[PDB]
Amino acid sequence: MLARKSIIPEEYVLARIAAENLRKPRIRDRLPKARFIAKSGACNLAHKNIREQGRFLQDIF
């Protein structure tokens, strides 16, 4: 209940080793290149803002 309500001790927490020495900023965590058609032979894009044409009772059948 109310773990750290008292909030005085901060603004002087010294820089970590990876901070000052600049070992953390070596991210090297780039996202993979976006494919157009997957290796499994399935196209994977994301169409958006398509006007929804509702549904039809024929779809249940």
Ligand X SMILES: COc1ccc(Cl)cc1C(=O)NCCc1ccc(S(=O)(=O)NC(=O)NC2CCCCC2)cc1
The DSSP letter of residue 35 is P
In degrees to the nearest 10, what's the CA dihedral of 44, 47, 51, 53? 0
Q: To the nearest whole angstrom, how small is the minimum distance from the Cβ of residue 21 to other proteins? A: 6
Select the binding partner of residue 1 from ligand X, other proteins, none (C-beta < 5 to 8 A, by kind): ligand X
1 near ligand X, rule: CB under 6 A:
yes
- CB contact set of 18 (below 8 Å; sequence gap of 6+): 24
Binding site for other proteins (CB under 8 A): 14-15, 19-23, 25-26
Q: Which is nearer to ligand X, 2 or 50 (CB)?
A: 2
